C-alpha cells in the first residue's frame, strides 16, 4: 500500500523563499589514488600536478591543500628482498629530512607507510610543486593522497 | 573529554598504514547547482538536464545525475504593473506530471520563488538528453538551484 | 461544545502563498475489464485516466497496489479464480498472484503491492498487469497516485 | 512492507465499497478583473474548470475566501481590496478591507464562512463582491468540491 | 494429539479452511555466483542475461532487480603485478562513472570490489540489459550478485 | 529477551551507488534449496482413490524442473469442482510413504453444497525424507471430479 | 442455575453443534505391544514386524508401524547353573546395526531384561516383511514389549 | 535424549501389560432416513474394521452429534432431531436443529451424563433420528472396550 | 545443491561442507554413497562427522 505521510510517493511543493547564497565551484575533500614510477637507489619527487586531472574529476582545480600521504609498493620487489617504501615530506617553506619507512614482512605482500601533515603546514600547492620524495626497491609505488581541492 | 582530540602537533607524524584500501578515483558528488534559463512570457520551457554537466560546476566528468529537488526564482524584474511569478511542472521519463507548483511575489521589487521535492520512488538517473521541469513566468529569466547527486 | 461562530469572520491574511492549481491526487480507481477463457488480458494504464474518475486531467500516474475481483459467475461446476501478473516497463514479471473462491456463488479475489523501488510513473500506452480468469469479466480496484 | 524490493501478494477479501467520483478539498487560485469604484461579483463557475481538475464537478461548498491585489495600484495610492460575502439565503453587508502599508506590496484580506452557512453553490451562483483600486485581484478560495 | 506434549512421531490432521491465495511462480531472493572473462585495458559489460539460467534454477525468470554486486579476481595477476578489479555500475536511466576499485596487497591473493545500488535505482532488468563494467588485470573475474528474481 | 527496542534501518539510506569493502571470496551455491507451497490440481474418479504423483511437483510451471528431489512437509486439499446433486462435497487423504503406507483417511466435508470441502495432514519430522518424481504423496478420494492441492515442501 | 443444579447434571443435554468437522475413520493409535518369540541356543532370531499386526492387539487394520523403543525379557527359565541373559541387535532397512544391548539376571530364578531406544532420525515406518532386531538368549523364549506408533 | 543412534534402556521387572486395551474415539458413519419415519441407530454400526474396532464387542457412548448428509426437500430448510435411547428406559427428547440456509447442513447433538454411560452391544440402539434429508451423518464420541 | 568453496589465495586450500538435517540422518552402508565431489585440484581431503552403529 505504502504510506500517505505525505504522501512520500508524489512530487511535493517546497515553500522556498529568498534566493540563497550559491557556489557553482565549491571545494572537495578527496582521496586521490595514483601511481608513480620509481628507480632503484633514486628518490622520485611526487608532483602535485598529478592530483589535477579528469581521471579524478579534479581538473577544474588549480590548487590543493594536502592533508595526509600514504604509499604502497605497486610491483614485486627484487629477488630475495622484501618490499620497502620511504616518504620524505617536502614543503615550499622548507623541505624535511624525515624518511618515513615501511617494510613488508612477506615478500609477496606490499610495503606501506604514511605521514600526516600538521595543520600549521596545510597550505595550497600548485601543479608545479612537489608533495614528497618516494624511495623504494619496487619500480612502482601506489599513492593515496587525502587532500582538499579548492 | 577533550584533551588532544587526535594529535594536534606541529610536525609530520608517521601513519602506520596497512593493506591497500578500497579506492575510487571518480566518486559521486552531491551538489546544489545554480544556473539560469531564459524564458518567454506565456510559453513553458523544458529545462534540459544537460545544463547540470559543465566545467562551470566542476560536474564535467559525469554523464548522469539523480535529481532530488528543484527550486526556482525569477532572475529579472516582471513587466510593468505586474508581480513576479514562476511555475514548475516536474518532468519524468516514465511520465510527465501535470502539477504547476507556482509562487508569486508580494512585492513588485521582489523575486517570485517556488520549488518541489522529488519523492524517493522517482529518483532515477537522468542524462543530458533528458528534461527536469517546465518553467513559466512573466520574467524573462529564471534562476534555478537544483539539489542532485552526480554519478 | 465544539462549534464556532454563526457569522462571517475576518481573516488577517498575509503574503500571497504558494499555490498549485493542478495538484496530485491519491485515489482508489474501480473499473472492470473483459477477459477471455484461457487468454491473458493486459490491463491498460490508460483506463485510469477518464472523466468518469475525475482524472481526465492527468497524463501520468504512480500505481501502488492492484486488487482484482471476478465480476461474473464462473463456468458451470467450477469455482471462480483470477490471476495477476505484474507488468513493468523495466522488466515484466512472471508471478501469477492467484486467488480462488471457496463458494461458487462468491467472487474470487487477489492483489499485489508494488514496492517503493518500482513505483515510477506510467502513461496510457503502458500496462499494469495481465489478468486471467474463468469468469468473463474482472473488477479491479487500483490504488494509485495521480500526478 | 516497504523493506520488500519486489511485488508481494495481497490477501484481499470482499469487494469493498467504492466510489469513482469522490469529493475533493482544494485551494483554488485564480484572478478576476476589477474596475475602479465598481464591485465585481465573483462567479462560482470560475471554480469548475480543467485548469483545476474540477470540470467534472457541478457543486462546491465554499469554506473561506482570500484575496490579493494582482496589479499595481494607482499613482500615490496604497493598494486596497474589499470583500462582501454573498449568500443565496441573503447577502451580507460586510466590507472586509485590507490595505498595503507599502505601495509596492499587495493588499490582502479574506473571510471565513461559518459552518451553518457552508452549503453548496453552483456555477451560476456568486461567492462575493470584490472592490479594489488595482485592476486585477488574485483570489484563493478554500472550498470542498462535491 | 501429537505424542503428548512432544514433537510427535506420526501424521496429524490439519483443520484446513478456505482455499488460500496461491502463486505457482513466486519471487526469489538470490546470490548468484558466476565468472566473466576480462582482458587487459578494456572494460567488459556484464549482461543481466547471465543471471537467467538453469544452472541457477532461474531460467523461469525474465526480469530481476539487482541490489548489490561483488567481484573477485578469479585468476592470478600478471608477473610482478598485484591483482586489481574495478566496477562501474550501469543503469538504463543513466550509466554511472564510478570506478569502484579494489586491489590485493598480496600477489597470491584475490582483489575484491563491491558496490550497493540505492533503493531508488532498484528497478527490474532483462537479459538484454547490463549490470556493470568490469576491469581487471586478471583474465577472469568471479562475480556474486545479490538480486531479486521476479 | 528484551527484543522490544532498536530499529536499525541500516542507519537510514542514500540515493547513489556506494562502495562495499568486500573481503575473501565467500562460500556459494548456485543451485540452492527452496521451501515452497506448490498449488496444482488432480482429476479424481468417484469412489476410486487417486495416487498423487510427486513428479507433479517438478515442473517449469513452479520453477522447480531443476529439482529431482523434494521433502514433503504438509498436504492440504480442496474439492475443485461442484459435488453431485443433493450431495455435500468431501475429500479424503491417505498419506503414503515408501517405508510403509498409512491407513489414515483424513476427511473433511463441506457444510454448504456450494462450498468447498477441505482437509490436510502434517508429516512428522521422522518421516520427512526425500521423494522423487516416481514416488507418491498420498491417495485422494472425493465425490468431486477434481481436487486442488497445496503441498508445502522443501525442494533440494 | 437455569435448569437448577446443572453442569454436573444427571440428565441428557443439547449440544449446539456447528459445521461438520474434519473426521478420520482410521486414526493412528500409539501402543505398547506385548508378544513372545521362541529362541534357540547360539542362534539369533530376527523379530518380524508382522507380529505387531494381529487382531489379538486390535491392530489387524494397520499395515505400517513406526517403532520407537524395544524391550525384552527372558520368558522361560535358563539352563542349569546359568544366569539368564538376553541380547538385542537393532535392525534397520537403511542399514543393520552391530550393537548387542545385553542384559543378565543377578538371580537365576529372575528374568534377564534389556532394551534399546530408536532415535528420532531412525523412526520410519516398517512393514510386516521387515525385521525389528535380533534376539539371542540362553532361555528358550523371550517376552517383548515394543513401543510403536501404528498408522 | 537428543541423539542420532540407538541407546540402551536399563529396563527392570516385566511390567503389567494389556494386549487389548480400550480406546476413545469419535466414530463417523452415515444412516439412511425416510420422511416422517424415525430410524433407530444400531450400536452395531460402531463395530467395524472401517473404524479399526472390529475387535470390540461393547462400547460406552458419551455424546452423539448429527448432521444432515444430503440436501433437503425443495423450498424446505434442513432439520434433524435426535431422541436418546437406553436399555434402562428410552427418553422422549427430540433435540432438533434447523439450517438457516437451504444449502447448509442442519446439526444437533446430545451429551450422555456419567450415570447413564454404561456399555452397549451391537444389538443395542443409541438413538432415533428424524430428518427431511434422506441421509444423516453421525459423529459419536464413545469409549470402546 | 552444489555447495562450493573457493580459495582467496592460490597457495591455500579451498574448503566447504554441508550439514544433514535430522530428518535425513538414516544409516548408510558401504554400497551407499555420501555425496559427489568436484574440484580443479586432483585430490580432495574430507572429514565426515558421523555416528557409527
Ligand atoms: Mg611490493
Ligand atoms: Mg496590488
Ligand atoms: Mg440437508
UniProtKB/Swiss-Prot annotation, chain H:
Signal peptide span: none
Gene3D superfamilies xref list: Satellite virus coat domain
Entry GO MF terms: structural molecule activity
Cell compartments where the protein resides: Virion
Name of the protein in its database record: Coat protein
Keywords annotated in UniProt: Capsid protein, Virion
Any one Gene Ontology cellular component term annotated for this protein: viral capsid
Location, primary (coarse class): virion
TM region positions: none
Coiled-coil segments on the chain, per record: none
Organism from which the protein derives: Satellite tobacco mosaic virus (STMV)
InterPro entries to which the protein is assigned, alphabetical: Satellite_virus_coat_sf (IPR037164)
Further comment: This virus depends on tobacco mosaic virus for its replication.
The keyword Signal belongs to this UniProt entry's keyword annotation: no
Amino acid at each position: 500500500r505504502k504510506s500517505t505521510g505525505d504522501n512520500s510517493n508524489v512530487v511535493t511543493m517546497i515553500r522556498a523563499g529568498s534566493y540563497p547564497k550559491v557556489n557553482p565551484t565549491p571545494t572537495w575533500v578527496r582521496a586521490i589514488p595514483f601511481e608513480v614510477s620509481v628507480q632503484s637507489g633514486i628518490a622520485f619527487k611526487v608532483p602535485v600536478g598529478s592530483l589535477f586531472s579528469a581521471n579524478f574529476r579534479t581538473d577544474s582545480f588549480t590548487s590543493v591543500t594536502v592533508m595526509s600521504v600514504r604509499a604502497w609498493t605497486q610491483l614485486t620487489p627484487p629477488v630475495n628482498e622484501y618490499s620497502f617504501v620511504r616518504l620524505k615530506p617536502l614543503f615550499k617553506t622548507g623541505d624535511s629530512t624525515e624518511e618515513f619507512e615501511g617494510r613488508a614482512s612477506n615478500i609477496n605482500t606490499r610495503a606501506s607507510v604514511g605521514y600526516r601533515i600538521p595543520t600549521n603546514l596545510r597550505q595550497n600547492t600548485v601543479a608545479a610543486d612537489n608533495v614528497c620524495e618516494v624511495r623504494s626497491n619496487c619500480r612502482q609505488v601506489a599513492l593515496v593522497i587525502s587532500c582538499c581541492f579548492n
